[PDB]
From a paper:
The small protein AcrZ in Escherichia coli interacts with the transmembrane portion of the multidrug efflux pump AcrB and increases resistance of the bacterium to a subset of the antibiotic substrates of that transporter. To investigate how AcrZ affects AcrB, we determined cryo-EM structures of AcrB and the AcrBZ complex reconstituted in a disc in which a bilayer of E. coli lipids is encircled by the membrane scaffold protein saposin A (Frauenfeld et al., 2016). Trimeric AcrB cycles through three states in the transport process, and DARPin associates with the subunits in the loose (L) and tight (T) states, but not with the periplasmic region of the open state (O).
To test the effects of cardiolipin on the conformation of AcrB and AcrBZ, we reconstituted the proteins into saposin discs in which the E. coli lipids were supplemented with an additional 5% cardiolipin (i.e., to ∼10% total abundance). The increase in the cardiolipin content is associated with small changes in PC1/2 and PN2 for AcrB. For the AcrB set we used minocycline as ligand, and for AcrBZ we used chloramphenicol. Even though chloramphenicol or minocycline was added to other samples as well, density was not observed in this position for the maps for the AcrBZ and AcrB structures in the natural lipid composition or AcrB with cardiolipin supplement.
Numbering used by the authors:
A (entry chain B): 1 to 1033
B (entry chain D): 11 to 166
C (entry chain A): 101 to 250
D (entry chain C): 51 to 100
E (entry chain A): 301 to 350
F (entry chain C): 851 to 900
């Protein structure tokens, strides 16, 4: 193949042009996102039975759907959470490789046939099956500076006017809303309903009767009479548009002809649907909407188009309205994808000038500057073909490959330049002679590296979707590197190079170059005598190998395993959780203290604060709250004290003082949708019909008994909520009929007055809005006002709630969660700083075997993927080692030889394990990938030593020792070129803080460490292994 | 309403003897009350913690305390079946013939579930058996609705 | 899959035409082969467990967790769950001037979970320190609670 | 019974409100007759599985 | 594979069974299809031996 | 026309301008892919130009 692309150079070029243009059609089309879809596909059923409790929902909405989710394909979870606000949320979870659309329709339908089991009060509100990504591409906030507005007006002006506008946008997906679009609410005063002898039932009636739409028909409608010259529709009484019109409806008439209306009994207003959530942008009454990405689009351009759509309508909406962006990640994604481009173009520069240092010829340096871009562009084309995208993972994949991209070019260039110097042969003959040495070694290396990275793609499930990006990218990169080293690079060497005659070893004349050539020759002779001295002595430097292997294996255990580093995305979050029985005012007093702390003490870093009361994570209650803290650009936050890993600690320390409030500030995880902090998701299930109370006892027991082993269990938390007071009314069925009172009147009165009943719909400005009925807060806050509600018997005389009802308090759960149909409660935790996770898992599945009769355990979340996994990596790496050994026995034609090469994998590993220890770096996925890259290119720089030595001992029969000496001498130079270029291109990743710090460092530290060691150790050991193996066989 | 009573309320419901005794060493109020009107006596009688309810009244806890509706700790203990707590709160001066705002005695709460041993414990100590709630219901009519025979013969 | 989707999209037009006595029982659309993949039997070795008692346990605690399995399109139970069957007698109903319609009305008026509301709800007033749920009725959950139905 | 405007308010503007964000969608038309009948026609790109 | 998932899940309930309940398999077609393949596997093994 | 009144095509008229905008890139991608094939076949940049 190479000797073909020497007399046919232009042919090579037209490939390198195609697979260049083929990249351009992918630099412009490839969607740019932050992380790909690695989580297991999932969907979230949601349903708000309003004015309810946690048991009503469990028994009327959750258990029903939980029974009829039958015959779904690829189902793993059926998690469920019923709250006290009314909202049930059911989260399924399908396997990896599942179509989300098909699963979503299966669920939609299995529910569509479960709908006529739910009440006539959820079917109206409706349920909403939607995929779970939890991934806000960006959030948009809308404020009124003046202060004339509220949340319930900005929310409407956003929904009716803008949600539509940014929905026609390119790649916008689903749009969520904070707040609630307008809705007319009727607040009733039971002190006035008794006077007029009314109730909130004939009110429901008069509102359902005097707003409904009625069908009438047509005029001249077919079948007509012969002689009709007219057809026109007929239109009867229709919906009520303006609120004033609601004040014009009739309820009754008195004996004196006095006409009763709504105005004189109730209070009509336009507000929101649910008032539970309260958002504030730095205390300013505010709201907003949230955008998440469409699958297969570019986030940068999407955000740049939304920031435009929001200006296209800047002037139209009222004066005093402002638009702010509390949470966005594109300001971080742009950097995270640019800080690697300026690394790849910095690496081609360094490998260009390093070859100006060693080769000292312009035409010799241009050749890799041409090959590496070709390889990168072909890699982009291959990704575009497989549907893959541009991410952080995929770009770091080619970053930690660039060494293997430059190595396959300099190995071709320096060998032809060594031949032209040692024999004076012209470039054509010199190349056609060199490729008579390498054309097979490069194919063997292709197979080796394919076997090294490929197995990483078949791994676990969620880490599979990460290792797969990395593996696909790096394998494409090396497959194209070897081809351009067999197709284009040698042709470039046959044309661009310039003839030099024999004896041009390089002495240099005046500058750095003469000094460098002289010192290179001297160091080469000395190193060669040194390797000879070592070859005289085996044992020594054969037992040091065991020392290094032992140190490596002993460092591989003091390395705290992790998944991904947390970084500075420019945003973090604060969580407020108050005691049970807590109101909204106290939570807002706490969130205003949070805001004052963040805007008074940390205004040099903090841009804004988006507080949301009622939107907590692991609860929608009136008790909790959240706050999205956004930070200035990274140039406005210099140093390390002004990062999030420090503001988090400052804020946690300061808010620990907040009385009666569990406050916790924390940074965002890398993968938002996924679990964080290497915890475990344990959970107790009751499989004997045990009560909620007995299972709560079992849980408290397990917790009290898990603090007994603080050696491997640190913070074992109940993710759920403790029981809280609740008001139990007992309707006397005897004294309710003794007076002639219908119970569907009592229950209706209660629910409407205290929970709100969706009555009907009305029209406003060409949009459908809802009609809610409720009591006025003043009359529904405490007990002992119950006696103010008078319901109507058939005898006319109105009776209070005091005659029917008795009252009491009880501690009933505010949240009830499930797992796979059965009741359950979740339990979180994390392994000690030194212990692994499997130990913490086996311990507490040994502590769970001692629980009462009928209580079992199950793992969920990230801990479920480790049960069906864990034993994949060792087997896959074993078969990879077998493949490598066979591919090398094929290349050398020997069963013993390969071990020499196969004994340099622990050299490049101890360097990374030493650097990540000196720097405190965990065993991330970036670290494993760097280990693999170092292994691969060390094996590459060793395979060629062995091939050279073997060819010298078969073609030239020089002998074992002499041939090994000549090989280490020949190959010394390129090995340093590669090591030096890679180290220099990666050093910025070890130093560069700010954006992409925890990832750039995690990659570069391991890479640099492995390289130093596999360079200054592999130059010395691999010849020892070669001679040892040749002697022993 | 003080920072020492809230901890007592938290630790009595969770069942912690060490923390409760400690907080009582520092002169905490054992007459503390939540926003509903509950001393740790109510929480213990509700959740079944003895070795605590024996401790709170030694430190001077009000036995006949009542919440915002009139429910003593006997009402909560007599409703679930805590006999070892019923025979205690009565030895310490609890009004067995008590009444909430509605008008139910602890008999009207013990005859509902079928805690006949507690019915005997209570009527041994002068529980009125001809008493009526605001509905005109005794313990006999309540034991008849539920159709029990033991509680039917206990009351003659 | 898309076949079942098309079939179930055409029901939605037909389901509002069926009576509330079918929908309320639950329609079922399912891919399936006509022959049983397998049968799984459950027996009480000792005694004190009638067919009814075994069939209940099977439906409750091991039927749903198996129909959710991936690969099982259809599952047939060889029995049935429990249910508060109410075997009535006319000679005692005409004695009280009653009929089954009043029985059903009373039941579905007294075995019902009401959307009561919320203590200290939203929007509240300035100066509220309490938040609670309200509870009025429950599902009678037993046999000695259905008998007290008035 | 609903006239052409009541259905564009109630039925159509609330469906085309959600139909945005569908993959490979070239255009969408809609018709709202006087008999209440409503039609919405979404046209996707070629090569799309229907 | 489905039958294996089911024979697993069943084992995941027997510990919580009351005193006396027992799971029997009166009808399974899978015991035949993993024996119909074994008697042909060992057949083609005997074949290479012979 | 007045302000706030735009126009847009559909049906075959949409595909018509789609093809009208496509053709100019097609005539180029089909030429700069003949130049390369010819230069490869004959290993000369002058033959394909001629």
């Amino acid at each position: 193949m190479p000797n073909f692309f020497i007399d046919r150079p232009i042919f090579a070029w037209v490939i390198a042009i195609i697979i260049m243009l083929a990249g351009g059609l992918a630099i412009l089309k490839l969607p740019v996102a932050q992380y790909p879809t690695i989580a297991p596909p999932a969907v979230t059923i949601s349903a708000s039975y309003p004015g309810a409790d946690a048991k009503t929902v469990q028994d009327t909405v959750t258990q029903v759907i939980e029974q009829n989710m039958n015959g779904i394909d690829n189902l793993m979870y059926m998690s469920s959470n019923s709250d006290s606000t009314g909202t049930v949320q059911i989260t399924l979870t399908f396997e990896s490789g599942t179509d989300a659309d098909i699963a979503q329709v299966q669920v939609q339908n299995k529910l569509q046939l479960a709908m006529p089991l739910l009440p006539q009060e959820v079917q109206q509100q409706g349920v909403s099956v939607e995929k779970s990504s939890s991934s806000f591409l960006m959030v948009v906030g809308v404020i009124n500076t003046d202060g004339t507005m509220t949340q319930e007006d900005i929310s409407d002006y956003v929904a009716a006017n803008m949600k539509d506008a940014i929905s026609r946008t390119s790649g916008v997906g689903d749009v969520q809303l904070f707040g609630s679009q307008y809705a007319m609410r009727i607040w009733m005063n039971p002190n006035e309903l008794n006077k007029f002898q009314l109730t909130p039932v004939d009110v429901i009636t008069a509102i359902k009767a005097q707003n409904a739409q009625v069908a009438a028909g047509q005029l001249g409608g077919t079948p007509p009479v012969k002689g009709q010259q007219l057809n026109a529709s007929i239109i009867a009484q229709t919906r009520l548009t303006s609120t004033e019109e609601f004040g014009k409806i009739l309820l009754k008439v008195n004996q004196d002809g006095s006409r009763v209306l709504l105005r004189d009994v109730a209070k009509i207003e336009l507000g929101g649907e649910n008032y539970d959530i309260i958002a504030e942008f730095n205390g300013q009454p505010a709201s907003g909407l949230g955008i998440k990405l469409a699958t297969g689009a570019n986030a940068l351009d999407t955000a740049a188009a939304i920031r435009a759509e929001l200006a296209k309508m800047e002037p139209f909406f009222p004066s005093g309205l402002k638009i702010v962006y509390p949470y966005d990640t594109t300001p971080f994604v742009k950097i995270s994808i640019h800080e690697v481009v300026k690394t790849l173009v910095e690496a081609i520069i360094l490998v260009f000038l390093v070859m100006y240092l060693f080769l000292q010829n312009f035409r010799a340096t241009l050749i890799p500057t041409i090959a590496v871009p070709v390889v990168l562009l072909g890699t982009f084309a291959v990704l575009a073909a497989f549907g893959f995208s541009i991410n952080t993972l995929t770009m770091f994949g080619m970053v930690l490959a660039i060494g293997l991209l430059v190595d396959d070019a300099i190995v071709v260039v320096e060998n032809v330049e060594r031949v032209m110097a040692e024999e004076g042969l012209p470039p054509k003959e010199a190349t056609r002679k060199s490729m008579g040495q390498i054309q097979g070694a490069l194919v063997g290396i292709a197979m080796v590296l394919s076997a090294v990275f490929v197995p990483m793609a078949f791994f676990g499930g969620s880490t599979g979707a990460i290792y797969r990006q990395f593996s696909i990218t790096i394998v494409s990169a090396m497959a194209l590197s070897v081809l351009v080293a067999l197709i284009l690079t040698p042709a470039l060497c046959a044309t661009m190079l310039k003839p030099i005659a024999k004896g041009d070893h390089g002495e240099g004349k005046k500058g750095f170059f003469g000094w460098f050539n002289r010192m290179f020759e001297k160091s080469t002779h000395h190193y060669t005598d040194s390797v000879g001295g070592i070859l005289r002595s085996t044992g020594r430097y054969l037992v040091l190998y065991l020392i290094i292997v032992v140190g490596m294996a002993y460092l591989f255990v003091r390395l705290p395993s992790s998944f991904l580093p947390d970084e500075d995305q420019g945003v973090f979050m604060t969580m407020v959780q108050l005691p049970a029985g807590a109101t909204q005012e106290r939570t807002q007093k706490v969130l205003n203290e949070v805001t004052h702390y963040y805007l008074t003490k940390e205004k040099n870093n903090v841009e804004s604060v988006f507080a949301v009361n009622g939107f907590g994570f692991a609860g929608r209650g009136q008790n909790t709250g959240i706050a999205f803290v956004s930070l200035k650009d990274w140039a406005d936050r210099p140093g390390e004290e002004n990062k999030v890993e420090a503001i988090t600690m400052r804020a946690t320390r300061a808010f620990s003082q907040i009385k009666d409030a569990m406050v916790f500030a924390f940074n965002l995880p890398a993968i938002v949708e996924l679990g964080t902090a290497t915890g475990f998701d344990f959970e107790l299930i009751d499989q004997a019909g045990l009560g909620h109370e007995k299972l709560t006892q079992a849980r408290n027991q397990l917790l009290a008994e898990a603090a007994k082993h603080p050696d491997m269990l640190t913070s074992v938390r109940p993710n759920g909520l403790e029981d809280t007071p609740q008001f139990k009314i007992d309707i006397d069925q005897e004294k309710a009929q003794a007076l002639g009172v219908s119970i569907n009147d009592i229950n209706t009165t209660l629910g409407a007055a205290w929970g709100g009943s969706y009555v009907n719909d009305f029209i406003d400005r060409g949009r459908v809005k809802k009609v809610y009925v409720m009591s006025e807060a003043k009359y529904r806050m405490l007990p002992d006002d119950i006696g103010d509600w008078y319901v109507r018997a058939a005898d006319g005389q109105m009776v209070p709630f005091s005659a029917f009802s008795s009252s009491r308090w009880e501690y009933g759960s505010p949240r009830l969660e499930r797992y796979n149909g059965l009741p359950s409660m979740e339990i979180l935790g994390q392994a000690a700083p030194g212990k692994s996770t499997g130990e913490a898992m086996e311990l507490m599945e040994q502590l769970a075997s001692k629980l009462p009769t009928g209580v079992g355990y199950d793992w969920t979340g990230m801990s479920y993927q480790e049960r069906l996994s864990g034993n994949q990596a060792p087997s896959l790496y074993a078969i990879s080692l077998i493949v490598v050994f066979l591919c090398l026995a094929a290349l050398y034609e020997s069963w013993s030889i390969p071990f020499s090469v196969m004994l340099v994998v622990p050299l490049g590993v101890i360097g990374a394990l030493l650097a990540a220890t000196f720097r405190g770096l965990t065993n991330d996925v970036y670290f494993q990938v760097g280990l693999l890259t170092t292994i691969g290119l060390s094996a590459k720089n060793a395979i060629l030593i062995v091939e050279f030595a073997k060819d010298l001992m078969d073609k030239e029969g020089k002998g074992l020792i002499e041939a090994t000496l000549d090989a280490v001498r020949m190959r010394l130079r390129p090995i340093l070129m590669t090591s030096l270029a890679f180290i220099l291109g990666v050093m910025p990743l070890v130093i560069s803080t700010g954006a992409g710090s925890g990832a750039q460092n995690a990659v570069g530290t391991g890479v640099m460490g492995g390289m130093v060691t596999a360079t200054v150790l592999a130059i010395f050991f691999v010849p020892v292994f070669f001679v040892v193996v040749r002697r022993r066989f | 309403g003080s920072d020492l009573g809230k901890k007592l309320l938290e630790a009595a419901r969770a069942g912690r003897d060490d923390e409760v005794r400690i907080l009582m060493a520092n002169g905490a109020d054992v007459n503390a009350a939540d926003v509903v009107g509950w001393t740790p006596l109510h929480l213990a009688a509700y959740w079944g913690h003895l070795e605590i309810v024996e401790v709170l009244l030694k430190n001077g806890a009000d036995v006949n305390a009542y919440d915002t509706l009139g429910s003593t700790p006997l009402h909560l203990a007599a409703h679930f079946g805590h006999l070892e707590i019923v025979e205690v709160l009565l030895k310490n001066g609890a009004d067995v013939n008590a009444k909430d705002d509605n008008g139910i005695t602890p008999l009207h709460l013990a005859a509902n579930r079928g805690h006949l041993e507690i019915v005997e414990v209570l009527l041994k100590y002068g529980a009125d058996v001809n008493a009526q709630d605001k509905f005109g219901k005794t313990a006999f009519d309540i034991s008849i609705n539920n159709g029990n025979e033991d509680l039917a013969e206990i009351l003659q």
